[PDB]
Amino acid sequence: EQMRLPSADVYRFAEPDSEENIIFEENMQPKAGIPIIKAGTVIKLIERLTYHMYADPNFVRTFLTTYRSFCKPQELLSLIIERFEIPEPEPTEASAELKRFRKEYIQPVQLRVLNVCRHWVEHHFYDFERDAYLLQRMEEFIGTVRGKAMKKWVESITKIIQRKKIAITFQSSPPTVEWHISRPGHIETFDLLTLHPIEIARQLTLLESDLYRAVQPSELVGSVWTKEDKEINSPNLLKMIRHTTNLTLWFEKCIVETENLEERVAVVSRIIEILQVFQELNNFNGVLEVVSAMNSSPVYRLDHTFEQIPSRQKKILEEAHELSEDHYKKYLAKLRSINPPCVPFFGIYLTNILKTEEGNPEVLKRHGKELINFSKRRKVAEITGEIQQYQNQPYCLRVESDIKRFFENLNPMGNSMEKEFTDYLFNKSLEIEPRNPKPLPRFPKKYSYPLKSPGVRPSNPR
Amino acid sequence: MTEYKLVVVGACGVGKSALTIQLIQNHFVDEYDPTIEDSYRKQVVIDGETCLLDILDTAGQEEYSAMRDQYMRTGEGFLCVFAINNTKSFEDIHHYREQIKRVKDSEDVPMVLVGNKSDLPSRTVESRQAQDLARSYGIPFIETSAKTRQGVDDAFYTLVREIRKHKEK
Numbered sequence: 315e316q317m318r319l320p321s322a323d324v325y326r327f328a329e330p331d332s333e334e335n336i337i338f339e340e341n342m343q344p345k346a347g348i349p350i351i352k353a354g355t356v357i358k359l360i361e362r363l364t365y366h367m368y369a370d371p372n373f374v375r376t377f378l379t380t381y382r383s384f385c386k387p388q389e390l391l392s393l394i395i396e397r398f399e400i401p402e403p404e405p406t407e408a409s410a411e412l413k414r415f416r417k418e419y420i421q422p423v424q425l426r427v428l429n430v431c432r433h434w435v436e437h438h439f440y441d442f443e444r445d446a447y448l449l450q451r452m453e454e455f456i457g458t459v460r461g462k463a464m465k466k467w468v469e470s471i472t473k474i475i476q477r478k479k480i481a482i483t484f485q486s487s488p489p490t491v492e493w494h495i496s497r498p499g500h501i502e503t504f505d506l507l508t509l510h511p512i513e514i515a516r517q518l519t520l521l522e523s524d525l526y527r528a529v530q531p532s533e534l535v536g537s538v539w540t541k542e543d544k545e546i547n548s549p550n551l552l553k554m555i556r557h558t559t560n561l562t563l564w565f566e567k568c569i570v571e572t573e574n575l576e577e578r579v580a581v582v583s584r585i586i587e588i589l590q591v592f593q594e595l596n597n598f599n600g601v602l603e604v605v606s607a608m609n610s611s612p613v614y615r616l617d618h619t620f621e622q623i624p625s626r627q628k629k630i631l632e633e634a635h636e637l638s639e640d641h642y643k644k645y646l647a648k649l650r651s652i653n654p655p656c657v658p659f660f661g662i663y664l665t666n667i668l669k670t671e672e673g674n675p676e677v678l679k680r681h682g683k684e685l686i687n688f689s690k691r692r693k694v695a696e697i698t699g700e701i702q703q704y705q706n707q708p709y710c711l712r713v714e715s716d717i718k719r720f721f722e723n724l725n726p727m728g729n730s731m732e733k734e735f736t737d738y739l740f741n742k743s744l745e746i747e748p749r750n751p752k753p754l755p756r757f758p759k760k761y762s763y764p765l766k767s768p769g770v771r772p773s774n775p776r
Numbered sequence: 777m778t779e780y781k782l783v784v785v786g787a788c789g790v791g792k793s794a795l796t797i798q799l800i801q802n803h804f805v806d807e808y809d810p811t812i813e814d815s816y817r818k819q820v821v822i823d824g825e826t827c828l829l830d831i832l833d834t835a836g837q838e839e840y841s842a843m844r845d846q847y848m849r850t851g852e853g854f855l856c857v858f859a860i861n862n863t864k865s866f867e868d869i870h871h872y873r874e875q876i877k878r879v880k881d882s883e884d885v886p887m888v889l890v891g892n893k894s895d896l897p898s899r900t901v902e903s904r905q906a907q908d909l910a911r912s913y914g915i916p917f918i919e920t921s922a923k924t925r926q927g928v929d930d931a932f933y934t935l936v937r938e939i940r941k942h943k944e945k
């Protein structure tokens with residue numbers, strides 16, 4: 315015998331599985347041996363989210379990350395409450411079938427709903443911060459729950475709710491902080507060539523790591539960073555991108571405002587040294603912010619400058635550029651093969667999420683019936699999961715609060731608009747190295763300190 | 777077999793993705809994983825000459841504004857895409873063209889203007905306006921509808937024809 319549920323008239327989740335309400339991918343869930351749901355009606359998705367035969371952690375995560383495109387939070391809570399409130403089938407002729415049904419259907423299902431509530435409140439609490447009534451309803455539902463088996467989960471959910479309404483140190487010793495010409499405390503002299511290139515790279519890697527770590531799936535799912543409310547919905551992602559952009563621009567500016575050729579060679583050379591350290595730290599955001607500056611139209615055209623770059627650093631730069639070639643082929647292979655800590659380049663994820671959402675239909679149709687395309691959401695959740703795997707492990711580097719502040723408050727554009735600023739950079743490029751056949755002018759030196767790099771190897775041991 | 781490296785540029789919200797996806801995905805499968813390599817490469821016959829299109833579409837990376845030169849530098853030919861229901865995206869076309877000319881160091885870069893239609897709001901850029909802009913640049917104008925696939929082939933194939941004509945010289 316199967317079970318004998320109620321009729322679909324009095325309880326909507328009893329309806330049998332068919333080709334018109336749920337469909338599956340051919341392959342089975344990794345590690346777990348569970349079917350992979352391709353599509354289904356929202357009722358069937360909720361049935362499987364709270365399925366009586368087994369638990370489905372992966373489906374629960376995926377669903378709670380991605381549901382909002384097809385179901386509103388209020389509607390989800392209504393549906394899981396409906397799911398929970400199971401009636402008993404028609405009178406027992408008075409309990410063979412009732413103690414079985416209570417133990418193998420009602421109780422498992424009710425526990426799975428509580429599990430969903432727990433995971434929702436723990437990992438997607440923003441739904442509740444944004445809709446106070448949604449939280450009100452969850453709290454009065456959780457108070458409803460009566461069973462003795464349920465007591466422990468009800469207690470735990472209430473405890474998580476209470477924690478969520480409320481407003482780095484190392485494993486072993488981080489390396490000694492590096493200083494070059496600028497001495498500690500003298501923030502007024504800090505600049506590209508006066509700070510130690512190692513420490514520039516370390517402190518930028520620390521900033522960019524924290525920026526990467528702050529970005530949450532809520533800022534990404536639904537491609538919300540590309541929409542009109544992007545500043546409302548994706549503030550951390552945007553801060554992160556703006557930093558990257560700022561630094562690329564600062565590198566360009568340092569280059570083209572150094573008008574003396576010898577000095578400009580030292581500047582480009584020092585920027586390549588910083589890239590080398592980024593590469594050592596697996597800060598690929600850092601790597602790409604240098605590569606972008608070097609490929610920029612004001613910088614790339616400086617053939618006289620590039621000519622004087624030592625061959626070793628040419629090779630370093632060329633290798634880094636090749637990461638980006640053929641649609642990030644080499645970058646992707648390199649990223650797969652390294653372990654935390656690192657700072658990925660976020661742009662790839664953004665494009666992949668957007669294209670996944672744009673290039674697949676929201677629903678599939680079968681026998682005239684509309685099914686939510688769940689596989690589309692799974693793919694998006696796979697990408698946000700890959701993002702999250704590099705967010706857990708911090709770098710073993712000491713913060714230097716003055717160097718940190720210097721890079722946080724960098725503002726190469728100043729009061730100028732983008733077009734105006736990039737035109738200025740380009741016109742500066744034209745001034746310092748005119749187009750053929752115009753000959754190369756000389757320009758006086760601007761730096762009164764030595765140009766020689768301390769290099770990229772630590773000064774003291776361990 | 778000749779390979780044409782094409783680059784799609786335009787404002788976000790334009791449905792740049794849709795254009796490229798509709799080119800590449802098989803004519804009657806609505807399925808797409810952008811993580812695999814066939815996602816951005818397609819073999820096609822244009823004027824009887826088999827060739828390979830490689831299409832770079834960085835949709836979603838528009839905020840990385842300092843990376844535009846890097847991405848543009850990779851291309852031989854450019855689709856400049858706006859949405860017919862977004863006047864601002866139409867006006868931004870001028871800037872994309874200037875930036876491409878600057879990156880390729882040339883006045884005569886293979887290029888096509890594409891006006892894409894999808895869903896509401898209704899049209900705010902009449903095709904005449906876009907025909908006039910395209911004529912002032914001396915490039916072709918193609919209007920497309922992502923959702924019906926109308927004009928998508930014509931947009932890309934016209935760009936390839938522009939590159940061939942540029943390479944003769």
Ligand SMILES: NCc1nn(-c2ccccc2)c2c1CCC2
Nearest residue numbers: 608609613614616617620632635
């Ligand atoms: N055209 C000279 C030149 N090429 N590159 C270059 C080389 C490889 C990758 C990225 C950029 C740079 C210059 C001036 C400084 C940067």
